[PDB]
Design an enzyme around this catalytic site. Structure first.
Site, PDB file in Angstrom:
ATOM      1  N   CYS A 176       0.814  -1.103  -0.287  1.00  0.00           N
ATOM      2  CA  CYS A 176      -0.092   0.117   0.064  1.00  0.00           C
ATOM      3  C   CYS A 176       0.673   1.500  -0.093  1.00  0.00           C
ATOM      4  O   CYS A 176       1.807   1.598   0.999  1.00  0.00           O
ATOM      5  CB  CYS A 176      -0.911  -0.052   1.165  1.00  0.00           C
ATOM      6  SG  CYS A 176      -1.987   1.496   1.177  1.00  0.00           S
ATOM      7  N   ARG A 223       0.067   4.327   3.048  1.00  0.00           N
ATOM      8  CA  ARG A 223      -0.014   4.236   4.565  1.00  0.00           C
ATOM      9  C   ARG A 223       0.475   5.340   5.398  1.00  0.00           C
ATOM     10  O   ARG A 223       0.498   4.995   6.505  1.00  0.00           O
ATOM     11  CB  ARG A 223       0.841   2.883   4.784  1.00  0.00           C
ATOM     12  CG  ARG A 223       0.398   1.492   4.380  1.00  0.00           C
ATOM     13  CD  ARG A 223       1.287   0.338   4.579  1.00  0.00           C
ATOM     14  NE  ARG A 223       2.520   0.444   3.520  1.00  0.00           N
ATOM     15  CZ  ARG A 223       3.694  -0.102   3.630  1.00  0.00           C
ATOM     16  NH1 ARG A 223       3.827  -0.721   4.706  1.00  0.00           N
ATOM     17  NH2 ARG A 223       4.332  -0.194   2.591  1.00  0.00           N
ATOM     18  N   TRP A 235      -9.181   6.302  -0.402  1.00  0.00           N
ATOM     19  CA  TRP A 235      -9.675   7.341  -1.717  1.00  0.00           C
ATOM     20  C   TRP A 235      -8.447   6.850  -2.819  1.00  0.00           C
ATOM     21  O   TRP A 235      -7.431   6.239  -2.494  1.00  0.00           O
ATOM     22  CB  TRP A 235      -9.490   8.909  -1.440  1.00  0.00           C
ATOM     23  CG  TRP A 235      -8.239   9.190  -0.730  1.00  0.00           C
ATOM     24  CD1 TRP A 235      -6.996   9.423  -1.487  1.00  0.00           C
ATOM     25  CD2 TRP A 235      -8.176   9.491   0.612  1.00  0.00           C
ATOM     26  NE1 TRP A 235      -6.044   9.821  -0.479  1.00  0.00           N
ATOM     27  CE2 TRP A 235      -6.690   9.901   0.720  1.00  0.00           C
ATOM     28  CE3 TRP A 235      -8.728   9.506   1.631  1.00  0.00           C
ATOM     29  CZ2 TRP A 235      -5.930  10.317   2.045  1.00  0.00           C
ATOM     30  CZ3 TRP A 235      -8.494   9.761   2.846  1.00  0.00           C
ATOM     31  CH2 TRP A 235      -7.140   9.990   2.995  1.00  0.00           C
ATOM     32  N   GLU A 261      -4.782   4.297 -10.644  1.00  0.00           N
ATOM     33  CA  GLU A 261      -5.382   3.181 -10.466  1.00  0.00           C
ATOM     34  C   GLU A 261      -6.876   3.196 -11.401  1.00  0.00           C
ATOM     35  O   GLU A 261      -7.054   2.196 -11.852  1.00  0.00           O
ATOM     36  CB  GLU A 261      -5.849   2.910  -8.794  1.00  0.00           C
ATOM     37  CG  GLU A 261      -4.948   2.836  -7.849  1.00  0.00           C
ATOM     38  CD  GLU A 261      -5.452   2.781  -6.554  1.00  0.00           C
ATOM     39  OE1 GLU A 261      -5.856   1.828  -6.127  1.00  0.00           O
ATOM     40  OE2 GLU A 261      -5.777   3.900  -5.472  1.00  0.00           O
TER      41      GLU A 261
END
Ligand code: HEM
Ligand code: HEM
Ligand code: OU1
Ligand code: OU1
Ligand code: H4B
Ligand code: H4B
Ligand code: ZN
Lengths: 410, 416
Positions: free
Chosen positions: B114, B117, B286, B291
């Site tokens: 991720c 973070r 969000w 992506e």
């Protein structure tokens, strides 16, 4: 155990048995993966098994395992390690070993070409003048007026570690970098240190933006000596843009021949510390890394300036827009000058095809996803979705320390 | 294993020292002789035995009391003993609310893949462990969606349904995300909508969903409670915030009729805390623009609009070395970011997100002794080297609490 690798775009699954043949270590463990770490003087005792391994794989490759020649070569190499602390490769073995070092280079996307390698045996070299002659012949042969041809020149192997042959340059052809009084950098920032070492060794810098560095050549462990590559040997490409007529006014150019000269070639336990090898460029290696890295030419801002892009906020993607245009210009310029170059789409497409070939005929292909994926537009290239297994086979190219950290002067 | 491991940033020369790797609990899949770092994933009866559960619970409880600077305290020894008795009498145990919240935040903090973070401690945790039915799951999920959406000022959140017991009573969200668009395989081989979701769309249609058969049909929720057969629910459309995609310069871009949903809410992963398995734990944050703009739109097995966009841009699409794909990819990602910002829906570009992750990583190394990171996932799918994570070495390792993959439920479910 057999290991599968899946391409999540085509759903092709390949089965790796080749990794079972490796003995060098990757740096990872069961609990820690070091896949993005950049880098994670033998004896007769250690040397014979490595030699036996390599002879066995060579005679296996030429379909003559356990033959008369094979048994005889084994004993021949046996008595020579005994009585000399080393051995010498046959010409055939040298060629086989250099091609397979390229074939095993997990980080190289260009390996579909691996068996098309011109091998120059320079094992009789004794002086830096001799190295310079061998290197000019390499540069001339490999450049071939723009129809570039892969080549490697192999200088004498390491003996005791005190008589190494070394090419101090990181590539045969690179541009000088000048740390300016006002703080910043003229030329190429990648080479600031090496440029200073050449000046301290006597090189008279022209102090331009694209000054081809001299060759700095160490033979048999002696001090290195400076040489100027004859300029007619150095093919260069003025970078222009097919739509932006102002691009050529940026005054940019690059050299046609990428020739890496600071790595170490290991074959059957022998170490070749000077082995410059060259191919042709993938366009991103110039247009992305050499031009837009923070610690390189760093020309992103000027191009976005001339493109009149809003550079106030990062979310305008002005850096991304300028990066694509620079890479368009690089490919266009090389192609218009009929100098060999490959774009990251064709190159990665070829590499997927290469993987298919290697899994079929060899049982696998060691491949380093972190390095194989291009530095731009990753996921719209086919390697992004290709699972890869990374493992270390020999013969291989290895990193070695910079010579100016080990060499005892005089 | 060596005690200190160094990572280097090759752009800034900053060298960081990792000691946290010594706490790593699960296997990466690499060995001494092979690296599996680009492998995407390296029985329902089987749950943790008592003997397996004890050390796992004590490890987590220790870590929790260490985090609140009460290690070795009376409350710590007491909690240990209470957990141990629960595992002895009932073969499992229940987490305190404080422990559940700490475990969920740390599962995010520990998620090597991720890039987001830096936000890990600002996670709203909804305790849905009293849920018993799929209607109750639907209520909890609607409340999650509305809170996290917040009229476009998105807030990260997780909703945690009851843990696994005997493995025959799992709670599961069959959806891979709470909000996704249907995909329909046509008779002629083409796909309408989102090709990533064709299989799940087919499952929903078989379960009774009446599909609108459009390009952007929000899928229904398919919700399994207490091991029962899953049930369908339509998310109220007023709760699904969407952004139509337009371009600041190209007026024709809106005529592509593209839009995307504002809330990315992954719902098929498993949350593991102290050996407890929370098989239904939808979490949302969000979006990073790529992506949507790179993967969701320009992947070949996704919406695959590169070609259409290049046409309207009048690019030469005959030779790849014109980089028409690269040029179009950028413009699409410009539009995605521009459309979200215009409608005031939280989104982050890949430059900002990766710079924050670098600052985050440095802080974690400073205050925690490391930060597990999966480079292959942290580097954005476009413009990799002009983001600061490209030149940043990273160590990858599996810490617990963690988010884990799990098999798709239609493959394991025992239909009633
Ligand atoms: C023929 C055309 C070739 C192309 C297009 C090509 C392309 C590339 C690229 C793009 C990289 C990554 C470089 C970077 O991003 O810094 C690479 C790495 C590498 N190439 Fe190739 N290459 C070619 C030929 C060769 C040849 C002829 C050799 C040796 C005989 C070779 C050996 C290597 C090695 C050893 C590496 C990685 C070095 C390391 O481990 O750090 N390549 N190549
Ligand atoms: C707040 C804004 C967030 C951003 C910008 C963000 C960003 C990302 C991105 C870009 C990825 C890679 C996704 C892909 O390429 O498919 C990712 C993966 C992931 N994120 Fe975050 N995320 C956010 C919030 C969260 C939250 C709230 C959680 C959990 C509490 C979380 C847990 C994860 C996990 C577990 C993965 C990867 C799972 C895996 O496949 O191993 N993220 N994130
Ligand atoms: C024959 C060849 C052709 C080509 N087209 N490209 C090539 C790139 C490299 C290569 C290897 C290591 C390396 O560096 C490792 C780390 C940056 C220090 C770099 C970076 N210049 C390039 C080596 C050979 C190449
Ligand atoms: C909270 C959150 C926010 C965000 N902004 N992004 C997120 C992306 C993922 C995620 C995790 C795994 C995964 O994929 C698993 C395997 C590749 C298929 C995908 C792909 N959708 C997304 C998970 C959570 C995210
Ligand atoms: C084969 C490869 O591991 C796979 O395509 C991965 C690569 N890196 C990724 N990185 C991110 N962020 N998201 C992904 O889905 C993937 N896919
Ligand atoms: C930190 C990271 O490993 C390092 O910057 C690598 C990543 N991948 C790369 N990939 C290629 N092809 N070339 C590189 O120089 C790098 N650099
Ligand atoms: Zn690894």
């Amino acid at each position: 155990r057999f290991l599968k690798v899946k391409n999540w775009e085509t759903e092709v699954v390949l089965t790796d048995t080749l990794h079972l043949k490796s003995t060098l270590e990757t740096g990872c463990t069961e609990y820690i993966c070091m896949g993005s770490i950049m880098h994670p003087v033998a004896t007769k005792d250690q040397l014979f098994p490595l030699a036996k391994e390599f002879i066995d794989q060579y005679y296996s490759s030429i379909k003559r395992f356990g033959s008369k020649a094979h048994m005889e070569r084994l004993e021949e190499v046996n008595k020579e390690i005994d009585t000399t602390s080393t051995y010498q490769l046959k010409d055939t073995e040298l060629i086989y070993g250099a091609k397979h070092a390229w074939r095993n280079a997990s980080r190289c996307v260009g390996r579909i070409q691996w068996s098309k390698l011109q091998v120059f045996d320079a094992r009789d070299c004794t002086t830096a003048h001799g190295m310079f002659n061998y290197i000019c012949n390499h540069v001339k042969y490999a450049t071939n007026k723009g129809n570039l041809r892969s080549a490697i020149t192999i200088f004498p192997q390491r003996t005791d570690g005190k008589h190494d042959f070394r090419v101090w340059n990181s590539q045969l052809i690179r541009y000088a970098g000048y740390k300016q009084p006002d703080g910043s950098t003229l030329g190429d920032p990648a080479n600031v240190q090496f440029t200073e070492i050449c000046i301290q060794q006597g090189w008279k810098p022209p102090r331009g933006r694209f000054d081809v560095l001299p060759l700095l050549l160490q033979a048999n462990g002696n001090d290195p000596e400076l040489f100027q590559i004859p300029p007619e040997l150095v093919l260069e490409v003025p970078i222009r843009h097919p739509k932006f007529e102002w691009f050529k006014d940026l005054g940019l150019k690059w050299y046609g021949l990428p020739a890496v000269s600071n790595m170490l070639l290991e074959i059957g336990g022998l170490e070749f510390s000077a082995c410059p090898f060259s191919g042709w460029y993938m366009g991103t290696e110039i247009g992305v890394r050499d031009y837009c890295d923070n610690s390189r030419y760093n020309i992103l801002e000027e191009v976005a300036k001339k493109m009149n892009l809003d550079m106030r906020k990062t979310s305008s993607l002005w850096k991304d827009q300028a990066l694509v245009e620079i890479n368009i210009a690089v490919l266009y310029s090389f192609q218009s000058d009929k100098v060999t170059i490959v774009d990251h789409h064709s190159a990665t497409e070829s590499f997927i095809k290469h993987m298919e070939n290697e899994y079929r005929c060899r049982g696998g292909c060691p491949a380093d996803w972190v390095w194989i994926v291009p530095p731009m537009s990753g996921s719209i290239t086919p390697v992004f979705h290709q699972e890869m297994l990374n493992y270390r086979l020999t013969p291989s190219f290895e990193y070695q320390p910079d010579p100016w950290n080990t060499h005892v002067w005089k």
